[PDB]
Structure formats: structure tokens, C-alpha cells
Design an enzyme around this catalytic site. Structure first.
Site, PDB file in Angstrom:
ATOM      1  N   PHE A 180       0.869  -1.105  -0.678  1.00 56.18           N
ATOM      2  CA  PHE A 180      -0.032   0.100  -0.416  1.00 56.18           C
ATOM      3  C   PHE A 180       0.789   1.714   0.398  1.00 56.18           C
ATOM      4  O   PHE A 180       1.821   1.032   0.862  1.00 56.18           O
ATOM      5  CB  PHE A 180      -0.743   0.419   1.212  1.00 56.18           C
ATOM      6  CG  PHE A 180      -1.463   1.030   1.271  1.00 56.18           C
ATOM      7  CD1 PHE A 180      -1.715   2.122   1.278  1.00 56.18           C
ATOM      8  CD2 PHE A 180      -3.643   1.081   1.052  1.00 56.18           C
ATOM      9  CE1 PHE A 180      -2.779   3.406   1.277  1.00 56.18           C
ATOM     10  CE2 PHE A 180      -4.602   1.877   0.225  1.00 56.18           C
ATOM     11  CZ  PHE A 180      -4.268   3.413   1.231  1.00 56.18           C
ATOM     12  N   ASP A 289       9.110   3.035   1.576  1.00 57.41           N
ATOM     13  CA  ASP A 289       7.952   3.814   1.825  1.00 57.41           C
ATOM     14  C   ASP A 289       7.919   3.370   3.280  1.00 57.41           C
ATOM     15  O   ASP A 289       7.212   2.727   3.630  1.00 57.41           O
ATOM     16  CB  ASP A 289       7.349   3.131   1.295  1.00 57.41           C
ATOM     17  CG  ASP A 289       5.560   3.855   1.436  1.00 57.41           C
ATOM     18  OD1 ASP A 289       5.369   4.110   2.715  1.00 57.41           O
ATOM     19  OD2 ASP A 289       4.816   4.167   0.989  1.00 57.41           O
ATOM     20  N   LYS A 320       2.353  11.193   8.108  1.00 53.16           N
ATOM     21  CA  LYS A 320       2.139  10.375   9.334  1.00 53.16           C
ATOM     22  C   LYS A 320       2.504  11.704  10.507  1.00 53.16           C
ATOM     23  O   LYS A 320       2.609  12.244  10.998  1.00 53.16           O
ATOM     24  CB  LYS A 320       2.083   9.025   9.228  1.00 53.16           C
ATOM     25  CG  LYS A 320       1.077   8.618   8.262  1.00 53.16           C
ATOM     26  CD  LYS A 320       0.229   7.082   8.439  1.00 53.16           C
ATOM     27  CE  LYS A 320      -0.862   6.844   7.739  1.00 53.16           C
ATOM     28  NZ  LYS A 320      -1.591   5.759   7.852  1.00 53.16           N
ATOM     29  N   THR A 344       2.584  23.758  -4.869  1.00 48.70           N
ATOM     30  CA  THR A 344       2.267  25.250  -4.435  1.00 48.70           C
ATOM     31  C   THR A 344       2.313  25.318  -2.896  1.00 48.70           C
ATOM     32  O   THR A 344       3.470  25.988  -2.471  1.00 48.70           O
ATOM     33  CB  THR A 344       0.798  25.385  -4.693  1.00 48.70           C
ATOM     34  OG1 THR A 344      -0.251  25.232  -5.802  1.00 48.70           O
ATOM     35  CG2 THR A 344       0.289  26.714  -4.564  1.00 48.70           C
TER      36      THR A 344
HETATM   37  C1  RW2 Z   1      -5.742  25.213 -11.516  1.00 48.33           C
HETATM   38  C2  RW2 Z   1      -4.850  24.155 -11.172  1.00 48.33           C
HETATM   39  N1  RW2 Z   1      -5.595  23.475 -10.625  1.00 48.33           N
HETATM   40  C3  RW2 Z   1      -4.186  22.163 -10.291  1.00 48.33           C
HETATM   41  C4  RW2 Z   1      -3.966  22.390  -9.514  1.00 48.33           C
HETATM   42  C5  RW2 Z   1      -2.795  21.306  -8.162  1.00 48.33           C
HETATM   43  O1  RW2 Z   1      -2.756  22.214  -7.007  1.00 48.33           O
HETATM   44  P1  RW2 Z   1      -1.737  22.357  -5.731  1.00 48.33           P
HETATM   45  O2  RW2 Z   1       0.116  22.332  -6.086  1.00 48.33           O
HETATM   46  O3  RW2 Z   1      -1.544  20.214  -6.807  1.00 48.33           O
HETATM   47  O4  RW2 Z   1      -2.168  21.996  -4.824  1.00 48.33           O
HETATM   48  C6  RW2 Z   1      -3.315  23.731  -9.286  1.00 48.33           C
HETATM   49  C7  RW2 Z   1      -2.008  24.371  -8.849  1.00 48.33           C
HETATM   50  N2  RW2 Z   1      -0.787  25.054  -9.586  1.00 48.33           N
HETATM   51  C8  RW2 Z   1       0.110  25.419  -9.658  1.00 48.33           C
HETATM   52  C9  RW2 Z   1       1.161  26.543 -10.016  1.00 48.33           C
HETATM   53  C10 RW2 Z   1       0.715  27.719 -10.768  1.00 48.33           C
HETATM   54  O5  RW2 Z   1      -0.967  27.724 -10.617  1.00 48.33           O
HETATM   55  O6  RW2 Z   1       0.996  28.141 -11.617  1.00 48.33           O
HETATM   56  C11 RW2 Z   1       2.176  25.802 -10.438  1.00 48.33           C
HETATM   57  C12 RW2 Z   1       2.141  24.729  -9.689  1.00 48.33           C
HETATM   58  C13 RW2 Z   1       3.209  24.084  -9.952  1.00 48.33           C
HETATM   59  O7  RW2 Z   1       2.850  22.563  -9.495  1.00 48.33           O
HETATM   60  O8  RW2 Z   1       4.134  23.929 -10.485  1.00 48.33           O
HETATM   61  C14 RW2 Z   1       0.316  24.598  -9.063  1.00 48.33           C
HETATM   62  C15 RW2 Z   1      -3.759  24.534 -10.502  1.00 48.33           C
HETATM   63  O9  RW2 Z   1      -3.291  26.247 -10.565  1.00 48.33           O
HETATM   64  C1  RW2 Z   2       3.036   2.329   3.329  1.00 44.46           C
HETATM   65  C2  RW2 Z   2       1.768   3.929   3.234  1.00 44.46           C
HETATM   66  N1  RW2 Z   2       2.195   4.296   1.976  1.00 44.46           N
HETATM   67  C3  RW2 Z   2       1.517   5.368   1.735  1.00 44.46           C
HETATM   68  C4  RW2 Z   2       0.415   6.202   2.478  1.00 44.46           C
HETATM   69  C5  RW2 Z   2      -0.122   6.982   1.698  1.00 44.46           C
HETATM   70  O1  RW2 Z   2      -0.422   8.554   2.605  1.00 44.46           O
HETATM   71  P1  RW2 Z   2      -1.444   9.372   2.592  1.00 44.46           P
HETATM   72  O2  RW2 Z   2      -2.846   8.875   3.023  1.00 44.46           O
HETATM   73  O3  RW2 Z   2      -1.738   9.203   1.087  1.00 44.46           O
HETATM   74  O4  RW2 Z   2      -0.975   9.955   3.127  1.00 44.46           O
HETATM   75  C6  RW2 Z   2      -0.222   4.923   3.555  1.00 44.46           C
HETATM   76  C7  RW2 Z   2      -1.416   5.662   4.513  1.00 44.46           C
HETATM   77  N2  RW2 Z   2      -2.350   4.173   5.233  1.00 44.46           N
HETATM   78  C8  RW2 Z   2      -3.503   4.204   5.282  1.00 44.46           C
HETATM   79  C9  RW2 Z   2      -4.165   3.383   5.739  1.00 44.46           C
HETATM   80  C10 RW2 Z   2      -3.193   1.962   6.428  1.00 44.46           C
HETATM   81  O5  RW2 Z   2      -1.471   1.591   5.847  1.00 44.46           O
HETATM   82  O6  RW2 Z   2      -3.952   1.444   7.062  1.00 44.46           O
HETATM   83  C11 RW2 Z   2      -5.476   3.442   4.894  1.00 44.46           C
HETATM   84  C12 RW2 Z   2      -5.525   4.168   4.566  1.00 44.46           C
HETATM   85  C13 RW2 Z   2      -6.141   5.019   3.241  1.00 44.46           C
HETATM   86  O7  RW2 Z   2      -5.950   5.391   2.478  1.00 44.46           O
HETATM   87  O8  RW2 Z   2      -7.086   3.638   3.670  1.00 44.46           O
HETATM   88  C14 RW2 Z   2      -3.648   5.285   4.388  1.00 44.46           C
HETATM   89  C15 RW2 Z   2       0.359   4.280   3.757  1.00 44.46           C
HETATM   90  O9  RW2 Z   2       0.587   3.202   5.238  1.00 44.46           O
END
Ligand code: RW2
Ligand code: RW2
Ligand code: FES
Lengths: 462, 461
Positions: A180, A289, A320, A344
Site C-alpha cells: 500500500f 516507503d 503520518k 504549490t
Molecule cells: C488549476 C489548478 N489545478 C490544480 C492545481 C494543483 O494544486 P496543488 O499545487 O497540487 O495544490 C493547481 C496548482 N497551481 C500551481 C501552479 C500555478 O498556478 O502556476 C504552479 C504549481 C506547480 O505545480 O507548478 C501548482 C492549479 O493552478
Molecule cells: C505505507 C504507506 N504508504 C503510503 C500511504 C499514503 O499516505 P496518505 O494517506 O496519502 O497520507 C499510507 C497511508 N496508510 C493508510 C492506511 C493504512 O495503512 O491502514 C489506510 C489509509 C487509506 O487510504 O485507506 C491510508 C501508508 O501506510
């Protein structure tokens, strides 16, 4: 102030107020997963308080993400400081406009617990984007190996924009059955825990290797376990070769030190050392991981530390317990250009602020060793219970407080969990006939004994 | 609350910033870093750096700071003892929500829910918002196809190993010039700049043209209508084609205003027709308001400009909204738990801040203010365009969401640098365009200040 002296139940769980709040929440979203509503203001140490006044010993700790208990006095003190107010209300775009104390606060937290051989650190908001950007880092690295010192070809540059080769290579990440690694579509492809996580979602044709299934008791299955691990390793190598032939080259291998959601599946340190060597042999980036195993519950801050390697991995992801997410990596995997690994927020400085103090508490109060100790007491208790109730308990396993055991079936698992909850103990389930333990780092041996006594009575009356 | 002008002491970045950038560049690539900031000293529309410089911030942390830096209402929020827990006890929201969860949602997100969308799910950022929206759409589509029957054994077994029919070969249709996130699902629907895409595995999904309008609009009405019609027809064509490739389009994702792709606009008519096309082919309509949301266009959500009682099926948000997530129609509600799920699903502290942010936006009438100050800024930009055609072209925008084009790379970069040294923080899109992303406490006198400074800048260029 630091903890209660024991659980104290008033009603069944969930209680009427919880059921009402669940009824409300269910209008705007599917709320079937909700256990109950909580009073985090009255929760303290190892004890979670719900909205019905029930006080439970929490051995699930918000899916293993609460590092040093609820409402810890040090963190309370942190939030009470005037100078910290800004950190909570002015969230920066860390990639372009970091705060003055960014590097120093990083030195006070993450950098002080960097894995051996990894001088690079990039912060992320959760484990999912941690693993995604680890994948991307690895792809960039592999392609960089292939083309360097040549520059981006015009064909690559123009085809990448429209989701085509050679701009978008057909590389793969090798993952294991039972793994996972997150819910985003990249992570999900390397996740193989439950069908309900995967079904109806498009995926990647990436290689999937078997993870060793150990037989218990371990001291009566030495040769068998050895052979199992060897088999799995050979199948890993064969998969790497097979997919190289497919022109879907494996750029990296991702693995958990202990498979959690897959059913708490352990493997020997030897296995991971050999897997590391295999990864190095075929030029695959080794990605560990530690999103769930990281934070010290296994007795060491990172679980992979048990392997005893100077070169344990190429990339290591976390979240976590670490409050913030992100990944450490070798300098070799440092991106040569900006805006390739980027978003961002890239985490949150407030989480760094909390994490510095969390880590200070872990070090000062010697909580790693405490985890080893309390986990040993707990495991001993569990082995006793296994001896006394072979009709309900089998395959008692664990490392530190990272413990678990199997029940007959899923219904019995859920019944046990429910009853324990009504008796003042919060449990969680992995695989889904396995009961798991994820206590916070302020979990002591007397909490182990509290649980063991309660569960003993439960088993006696089941 | 707010200063009354910029104040520069050094060049940007100054010495201390350069030292801190040197330090950071040890543990990671820091080339993207503009400068280090003193957020404790920042107030309102003004950002303060570590060299004592105070700049008028028209970028607002890539359009994610709703009501300015160090807002007294938020300060008050953090100062309350009863809120302490909320900042240090982060719950697994999917399973163990706090007592005030639903109520705080009523105070915030639920009070600005789009029309037709009674469902809401929270996320921590725009990327997981969009990803989980994708998954919600896939689930909904497969639900349409299998219709109220159990998962087959074959699907259950095949999905575990990344294979059909368990893992369908569905597609999401996106537009050229789009940006929806960096995670590998979002990245496939992202088509802004090559440096975002290069060397990363993707999805064979349909990519449609987004309209490139000609300016002045009043001089190219027919031309632009033709362009839009062309784009719509190509969208429908793509849907059919990919349906025939057994890679059925389950949904269409679009920004009300493209941004990272160079601030590309389109008529409301185009979006209404796109919505209709969407409904026609059984494609879910997903609107990405991560950047347009918050009220910079003069309405809280930008799609509100379209005037539709049924504007979309799903709408994602983040940035200004402190927390991320998406609204959706009841029919898109997942049939079972643990399909749309992660550990944190956002953060209650972000909700705490957001309720107050929305309260302020309401009480201070900041939507109308965005409309007005936006009008002033745009008028000014048009004036400068008239006066300096050799530098400014295609002046465009909605509310304070404004932008214009420069002749090329170098001129854009130079103008941003000079503006920065003059005390005005700007951002660039498409790497040729200059864009404006002011906070919601940006008023008309700030617009004047900028227009003024920048006017002298153009005069000396
Ligand atoms: C329309 C739209 N949709 C999704 C995202 C993803 O947001 P987040 O950066 O993952 O929180 C964004 C985040 N905006 C980003 C940039 C920008 O507006 O220029 C630059 C950043 C990048 O990843 O380069 C992310 C966005 O504008
Ligand atoms: C080894 C490992 N690698 C990645 C993730 C993903 O983290 P996040 O949930 O995206 O913050 C996790 C998060 N663990 C989760 C669950 C668990 O171990 O029981 C259950 C949760 C789910 O998405 O169902 C997330 C993890 O354990
Ligand atoms: S993907 Fe990590 S926070 Fe949204």
C-alpha cells in the site's frame, strides 16, 4: 495533563450523540467508514475521548499518525507562543518564497534524522504525493542516465506535451503483492492491498512481485522461510528482466519495511538487504516507503535501520507521524532543473514547527527504546493469549509496538474490535482478518498490561 | 492590518536571501527560490523579505492567500485557547471526525456550495482533489455500465493486478494549455509546459484544443466564435474517436480560466456549449476551480459567470480555500466506503481558518470589491497597452484575474525583475505573459499604486 490512568466507558460505541452527528454528516457524504465523533479537546496522552463522554485506550492512533499522544503539553506550549502565530496563518509557497527559518527549522527536525547516505530532502504534504514525486524523481534519474550528457531532444520536448513517447517513457515501478503506497493514480498502481481500493480505477501495466509470507512460529520454519524469501527474490529479478524485454524498463522498486494494510507482513532483514542488492544490480532505484513504519514504533526511528546498512536505499518517503510528508534521497537523484519536482505548498511550515518539538520529545524522553520495551511486553502478552486461545488467535507477530495477529475470519475480527471498543480499547484491522496495533510513542508497558487484561477478559467471555 | 506603500532597501534577492538560498541549495535544488520572507512582518497586501524589503504582492503565493498576510481575524483565531487542540490533534477525518466537523463545514464550504451539488469531500491539496474527482467519475461511469449489481469475481481478481476488466481503460478528456496538478493522474491532463511533463510516464487520453482568442475582442467577434466552434467540434470528435478506441471518455476536465498555460480565456457561451456536449455524451463535467475559486473574478466561483442552473457534475478547489476538496452531484456519491479515502482528507485547522475567511469575505463584501478593483486594474492596463504597444498586448482578464503579453521571454523576465526591485511582486504565465493574482483585500488604490509605478517603469524601459 500528560495522561489518564485508565479507560472509562459511559455508553456503547458509537453513542447517541455520535450516531446523530453521523446521521448529519451522512447527508453531504458517504459516512459509512466513520467509527464515531471525538472530543479531541478532552483527549490526552494515550486516551481518545468521544462526544458521548467515553474514554478509550487508543491503540490505533488515527491510523498511526499521532506521534506523541493527544494534546501533548509541549505542543500546547508551542501554539501558545505569540511569535508562532504567523506560522499558522501565513502559509507560503515553499518552492519560491520560503520563510526565514525554513532551513534552520529543517535542521531542528527532518535533517537531524536523515537516513544514512541521503543528503537530499524534499518536503510534501502527504505520503501519496511523497511517493508520486519519488516515482517522478526516479524516472527523471533513469532517463538522465540514459541520455546524459545529451540534452532534451526536440522530439522528446514536443511529444511529452501530448502524453506520447519518447517524451513520456514507458518506464515502470516494481511493487509487491499486499503493498500500500497511496490512493492517487500513480501510487494506486503500486498498491495491492484490497480490491475495494483498486476496482473501477484505470492503472499501469507495471510488474508485481510476490512478498514473502512467513510461517509462524519463526523458530520452527527457518529453512522454509529462507526458501520463501529466496523464491520471492528470484521472481523479482525475473520480473525486472521480463519487463526490460517488454521495453517497459523498471526504473525503480518500491517496498515497505513492513507491509501494513496488506496484513502486517514481515520479512527478514536479510531479505531486504538482498532486495537492495538486486535493485542495485539492475540499475533500479531502491525506494523505501516508511510512511507508516517511520517515526520509531519499531524501536528505531526508521524501520530500515534494522537492516544495518550504510547504503540502505536510494529514496525514502515519509508522512503520518512525521507531521509533514516528503522524501530523503541520494544526491545522485537530485533534479538538475527546477520546476520538475514541484507543487504549490510542498508541505506546511507549521507541521515542521510541531515536528521539531515532537522529535525533541522523542529524543529527550528516550521513546525509541521505550517503543522496543513496551512492544516487547505487549508481544509477550499476545503470545500468552495465543497460547491460551488458539481458536481465536494465531500468527502473533511484531517489531517494537508494530504488532498484529490473525483471527479465524473477518466477522470474528470485527466482533472482537467492536467489543474491545465497547470495553475501552480502540483497535484497527489490516488485511481484514488481522488485528493490528498502532499505538503512539507515549504508549508504556502499563498500557500494554491494561489492554492485555481487558482483552483477556473479552476472550474468556467470547 | 496594512501598510500604505512599498519600501525597498536592497535589490531582490538581497544578501541575506542569497545566503539562505545558498544554505538551502545544499539539501535540494533551490533554483526556483525567489527570496526568503519575513512573514511575521508581512501585513495585508504587502510581503516583507529578510532584507527588510516590503513589496506590494500581486502574486499572493501563487494565488493561495485569501485575505492577505497576518489578518487580525485569523490572529484572533489562533490566539483562542479553545482552538489549541485543533492545531495539535490532527484526526483521521474519514473515521474519527471532531465534534464540530459538520458545523464548521456549514460555516465554511457548505455555505458556498455550487448549484446542483449537495455532496462534498475534503482533501489537502488540488492534486489529490483532482485525482479523487477522477476516481469518483470512473466509479460513477462503471456504475452506470454495471447498474446496481455486485462486482464480478473476475473484476475483483483482475483489479488487484492492474488488469481489465477490474481496471477499466477509461479516459479523462483535457485541454491543451491546462494545468490540474503534478501527480501522475493530474499530470496526464496537464499540458502547460514541457518541463512539467518530460521523462514522466503518462496516459493515452484525449487532448483537445482550448480556444485562443484574438484581441481586441470587439474587433474579432466572428473570428473568435469560429475558433470556439472549431474547438467544441474537435472535442466532440475526440469523444467519439476515443469511444471507438475502447478508451471511453468518462469525464471532461476544464479550468474556467486557464492559467499556467498563459491565462487563456473563453466566452461563457463556449463553456455552456461544452457543458451541453458533456451531458450529451454521458461524460461527467469536472470544473477545476483550484485557482479561479475564492472570488477573484467577482463571483465566488468563476463558473457562476456562465449562469447555469446545472454548471457541472464535479468541481474541485484548493489554494484560497485553505483546504482542498470537491463538490459533486448526489448521483456521483460513492456507493461504498473506502473507495474515496485517505489518512487525513484535509485538516480541521484549515477549516477553522476558512470559516473565518469566508465570514470576512461576506461581511467585507469582497466579491464586489474584486469586481471593482479588478475593473480599475484592467482599465489601467488597457491605457498602458494603448501607450506602450511595443511592450504590452492582449490585455485581458476577469475581476482581478488579469494578464497581458510581452513581446518575448527576456522582456517579461526583465519587467518582472524591475517591478520587483521597485516594490511590486508579479508572476508570469506561459513564460511570455505577466499575470495578476492579488489577495482579496486588494483594493483600487493598490491598483492605482501599481499602475503608477509600472507606468514609470515602462516610461524608462
Ligand atoms: C488549476 C489548478 N489545478 C490544480 C492545481 C494543483 O494544486 P496543488 O499545487 O497540487 O495544490 C493547481 C496548482 N497551481 C500551481 C501552479 C500555478 O498556478 O502556476 C504552479 C504549481 C506547480 O505545480 O507548478 C501548482 C492549479 O493552478
Ligand atoms: C505505507 C504507506 N504508504 C503510503 C500511504 C499514503 O499516505 P496518505 O494517506 O496519502 O497520507 C499510507 C497511508 N496508510 C493508510 C492506511 C493504512 O495503512 O491502514 C489506510 C489509509 C487509506 O487510504 O485507506 C491510508 C501508508 O501506510
Ligand atoms: S496529494 Fe499529498 S496533499 Fe494532496
Amino acid at each position: 495533563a500528560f495522561d489518564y490512568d485508565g479507560p472509562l466507558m459511559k455508553t456503547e460505541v458509537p453513542g447517541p450523540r455520535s450516531r446523530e452527528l453521523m446521521k448529519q454528516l451522512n447527508i453531504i457524504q458517504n459516512a459509512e467508514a466513520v467509527h464515531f465523533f471525538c472530543n479531541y479537546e478532552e483527549s490526552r496522552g494515550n486516551y481518545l475521548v468521544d462526544v458521548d463522554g467515553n474514554r478509550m485506550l487508543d491503540l490505533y492512533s488515527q491510523i498511526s499518525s499521532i506521534p506523541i499522544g493527544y494534546s501533548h503539553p509541549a505542543l500546547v506550549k508551542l501554539v501558545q507562543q505569540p511569535q508562532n502565530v504567523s506560522t499558522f496563518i501565513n502559509r507560503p509557497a515553499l518552492g519560491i518564497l520560503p520563510p526565514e527559518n525554513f532551513v534552520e527549522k529543517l535542521r531542528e527536525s527532518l535533517l537531524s534524522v536523515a537516513p544514512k547516505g541521503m543528503s537530499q530532502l524534499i518536503t510534501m504534504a502527504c505520503g501519496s504525493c511523497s511517493n508520486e514525486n519519488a516515482f517522478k524523481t526516479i524516472f527523471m534519474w533513469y532517463r538522465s542516465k540514459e541520455r546524459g550528457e545529451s540534452a532534451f531532444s526536440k522530439e522528446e520536448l514536443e511529444t511529452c506535451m501530448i502524453n506520447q513517447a519518447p517524451g513520456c517513457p514507458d518506464y515502470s515501478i516494481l511493487s509487491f503483492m499486499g503493498a500500500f503506497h497511496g490512493r492517487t493514480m500513480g501510487c494506486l498502481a503500486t498498491t495491492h492491498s484490497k480490491a475495494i481500493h483498486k476496482i473501477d480505477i484505470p492503472s499501469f501495466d507495471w510488474p508485481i512481485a510476490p512478498f514473502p509470507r512467513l510461517k509462524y512460529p519463526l523458530e520452527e520454519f527457518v529453512k522454509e522461510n529462507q526458501q520463501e524469501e529466496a523464491r520471492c527474490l528470484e521472481e523479482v529479478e525475473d520480473l525486472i528482466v521480463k519487463y526490460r524485454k517488454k521495453k517497459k524498463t523498471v526504473a525503480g522498486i518500491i517496498v515497505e519495511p513492513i507491509q501494513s494494510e496488506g496484513g502486517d507482513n514481515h520479512a527478514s532483514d536479510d531479505f531486504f538487504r538482498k532486495l537492495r542488492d538486486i535493485s542495485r544490480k539492475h540499475g533500479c532505484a531502491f525506494l523505501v516507503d516508511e510512511v507508516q513504519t517511520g517515526g520509531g514504533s519499531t524501536g528505531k526511528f526508521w524501520a530500515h535501520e534494522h537492516w544495518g546498512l550504510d547504503d540502505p536505499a536510494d529514496v525514502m518517503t515519509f508522512s503520518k507521524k512525521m507531521m509533514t510528508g516528503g522524501f530523503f534521497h541520494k544526491e545522485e537523484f537530485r533534479p538538475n532543473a527546477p520546476y520538475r519536482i514541484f507543487n504549490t505548498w510542498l508541505g506546511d511550515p507549521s507541521k515542521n514547527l510541531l515536528l521539531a518539538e515532537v522529535i525533541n520529545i522523542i529524543k529527550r524522553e528516550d521513546l525509541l527504546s521505550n517503543a522496543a520495551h513496551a512492544g516487547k511486553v505487549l508481544l509477550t502478552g499476545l503470545l500468552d493469549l495465543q497460547a491460551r486461545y488458539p481458536q481465536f488467535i494465531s500468527r502473533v507477530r511484531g517489531r517494537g509496538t508494530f504488532c498484529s495477529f490473525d483471527t479465524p475470519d473477518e466477522s470474528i475480527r470485527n466482533k472482537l474490535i467492536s467489543i474491545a471498543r465497547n470495553k475501552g480499547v480502540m483497535l484497527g484491522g489490516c488485511g481484514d482478518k488481522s488485528i493490528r496495533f498502532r499505538p503512539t510513542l507515549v504508549f508504556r508497558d502499563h498500557h500494554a498490561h491494561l489492554f492485555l487484561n481487558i482483552f483477556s477478559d473479552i476472550l474468556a467471555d467470547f
